Structure 1
Amino acid sequence: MRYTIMVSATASDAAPLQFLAPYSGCAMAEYFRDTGKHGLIIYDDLSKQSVAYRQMSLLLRRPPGREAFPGDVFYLHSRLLERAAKLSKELGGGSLTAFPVIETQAGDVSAYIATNVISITDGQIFLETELFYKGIRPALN
C-alpha cells in the first residue's frame, strides 16, 4: 500500500461512479506515466463497468443494442485501454501497463463485452474453471 492507489466504486455506489472509476483510476495512474515513472493499473471487473454504463445509457434513453448495451460500449473500453502506453524518450520514457479483468459466463468467451476487450488488449490470460479444479492453480489455459 505504499506504492498502491486504490480506487473503489463499489456495488452500492451510483452507476456513474462505477462507470467513471476506471477513468478516475487511469488518470491517477497517468501521473506516473506522464512523469517518467511506471504505473500498473488493474481494472478489476471491467465487465462490471459496462453494466454500470448500460444502466446510465438505458436511463438516458439511448437505444439499446447487443444484450441491451449501448452501441458505443466498444469505445467505452477502447479509449480507456489505449491510455496504457509506453511513452517515448522525449516524453519521459514512462509507461503504464493495464490489467483489465473480464468475467465470462460459463466460459462463453464469445460474449459481447468479452469480444471487445479481447480485440482491444494485447494479450489474454484465460483462466478456465475446469483446470482450476484439476489442481492447476493459477488456472492458466
Structure 2
Amino acid sequence: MRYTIMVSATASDAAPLQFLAPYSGCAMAEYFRDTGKHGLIIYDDLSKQSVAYRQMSLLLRRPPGREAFPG
C-alpha cells in the first residue's frame, strides 16, 4: 500500500459511482504518467463497469443495442 491507490466502488454502491470509479482511478494514475513516473492501473471487472453504465443508459431511456448495451 505504500505504492498503491485503492479505488473502490463496490456492488452496493450506486451505478454512477461504479461507472465513474475507473475514470477516477485513471485520473489518479495519470498523475504518475504526467510527471515522468510510471503507473499501473487495474480495472477489476471492466465487465461490471459496463453493466453499471448499461443501467444508467436504460434508466435514461436510451435505446439499447446488442445485449441491451448502449451504442
TM-score, scaled relative to structure 2: 0.98
Provide structure 1 residue ranges, at least 5 long, that are not aligned to the other structure: 71-141
Q: Which has the higher contact order (CA 8 A, sep 6+)?
A: 2
In the alignment, is residue 5 of structure 1 matched against residue 1 of structure 2? no
Give the Cα separation in 1 of the matches to 2:66 and 2:29: 31
Which string of whole-angstrom CA distances, capped at 9 and with x for unpartnered residues, describes residues 85-113 of structure 1? xxxxxxxxxxxxxxxxxxxxxxxxxxxxx
Over alpha carbons, which structure has the higher Rg?
A: 1
The match for 2:44 is 44
Q: Which has the higher helix share?
A: 2
The Cα of 1:67 is off from its aligned counterpart by 0.5
> Which ranges of 4 or more aligned residues in structure 1 deviate by more than 6 Å?
none
Which string of whole-angstrom CA distances, capped at 9 and with x for unpartnered residues, describes residues 35-55 of structure 1? 010000000000000000000
Identity of paired residues, percent? 100
Give the Cα separation in 1 of the matches to 2:8 and 2:17: 9
Which string of whole-angstrom CA distances, capped at 9 and with x for unpartnered residues, describes residues 12-59 of structure 1? 000000000000000000000000100000000000000000000000
Q: Which has the higher strand share?
A: 1
3-state SS of paired residue (1:24): helix
Give the Cα separation in 1 of the matches to 2:45 and 2:17: 14
Provide structure 2 residue ranges, at least 5 long, that are not aligned to the other structure: none
Give the Cα separation in 2 of the matches to 1:42 and 1:28: 12
Give the Cα separation in 2 of the matches to 1:62 and 1:35: 39
Which string of whole-angstrom CA distances, capped at 9 and with x for unpartnered residues, describes residues 72-94 of structure 1? xxxxxxxxxxxxxxxxxxxxxxx
TM-score, scaled relative to structure 1: 0.49
3-state SS of paired residue (1:43): coil
